[PDB]
Amino acid sequence: PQVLRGSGHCKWFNVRMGFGFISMTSREGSPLENPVDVFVHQSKLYMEGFRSLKEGEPVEFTFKKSSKGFESLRVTGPGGNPCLGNE
C-alpha cells in the first residue's frame, strides 16, 4: 500500500493491550479541518525503552490505508525524536 505521512498527537493508549489511537491533525504538512483516528500498535513506536505513548504527546508518523481505515507504520516524536511514552 501507498505509504502516507501525517502528524498529530496521542489520543489515548492502552499500555496493557499494546495499542492506541493517534488523532491525526495534519497530512503531508496540511492541517485538517476534521482530525481523524489512526490506529497505532506498540511495535511501531520509535523509542528505546518500554513502548507506549503518553496521552497528548505530539507525534509524526507514516501510515497506510487498510480494510480498517488508517494504521500506523512508524511513529516518532517531533523532528524524528523518540516517542516519550509513559516512563
Side-chain angles (χ1 to χ4, degrees), residues 9-75:
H9 63 272
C10 174
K11 193 191 193 185
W12 54 263
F13 201 94
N14 188 318
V15 173
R16 185 183 58 82
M17 294 311 285
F19 68 84
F21 280 7
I22 290 163
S23 188
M24 177 163 62
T25 56
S26 185
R27 298 185 68 179
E28 282 80 20
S30 277
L32 297 178
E33 172 162 357
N34 293 128
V36 313
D37 296 331
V38 178
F39 180 87
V40 52
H41 191 260
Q42 57 79 12
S43 64
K44 309 308 191 177
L45 301 181
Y46 175 64
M47 59 207 299
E48 289 192 312
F50 179 64
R51 294 184 300 277
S52 69
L53 294 175
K54 181 177 176 180
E55 188 186 359
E57 74 169 282
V59 292
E60 296 176 354
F61 51 91
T62 52
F63 67 102
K64 63 175 180 181
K65 194 163 58 167
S66 74
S67 65
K68 293 174 170 299
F70 292 149
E71 299 185 51
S72 297
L73 295 167
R74 180 172 176 273
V75 183

